[PDB]
Amino acid sequence: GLIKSLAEKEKQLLERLEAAKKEAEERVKRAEAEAKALLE
Amino acid sequence: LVEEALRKALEDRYLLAHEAYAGGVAALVVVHRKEVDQAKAALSRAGVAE
Amino acid sequence: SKLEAILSQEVEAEIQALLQEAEAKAEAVKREAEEKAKALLQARERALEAQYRAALRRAESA
Numbered sequence: 001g002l003i004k005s006l007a008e009k010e011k012q013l014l015e016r017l018e019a020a021k022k023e024a025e026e027r028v029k030r031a032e033a034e035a036k037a038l039l040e
Numbered sequence: 041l042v043e044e045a046l047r048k049a050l051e052d053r054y055l056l057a058h059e060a061y062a063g064g065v066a067a068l069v070v071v072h073r074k075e076v077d078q079a080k081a082a083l084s085r086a087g088v089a090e
Numbered sequence: 091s092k093l094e095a096i097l098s099q100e101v102e103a104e105i106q107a108l109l110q111e112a113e114a115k116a117e118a119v120k121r122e123a124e125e126k127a128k129a130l131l132q133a134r135e136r137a138l139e140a141q142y143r144a145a146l147r148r149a150e151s152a
Contacts, residue, residue: 003055005094006055014101017101017104024111028119031120034123054093
């Protein structure tokens, strides 16, 4: 029964998907900084 | 009967396991949360159920 | 096995959508700013310039 293995694969993947999203939204918080600055 | 049904529906992307313990053999089908619909449908044919 | 292959690919195409999605929404914010400021620097150019020509007028008349 492999089972354990593939039920680990779903964790790794989720935290890679998670990680993509996070750095993604960081870029948004980055464009927010310039958006104030460029006006200031 | 459950295995054949599973194989056609799922392909082989599932884990089918069984062990005896008295009171039949406990069996499991494991699928992705996306394959769930198909996996259950395979069971419906087989006549065994959740 | 084949089980994990499908799970990878499924997750991976979703990754490709998150990353671009944040980025474009950042760029659009960035580009909003560029416009926002430009219309303001223009607007204060306009007003002051007329209030300049007209100001000197009132002097000239004096």
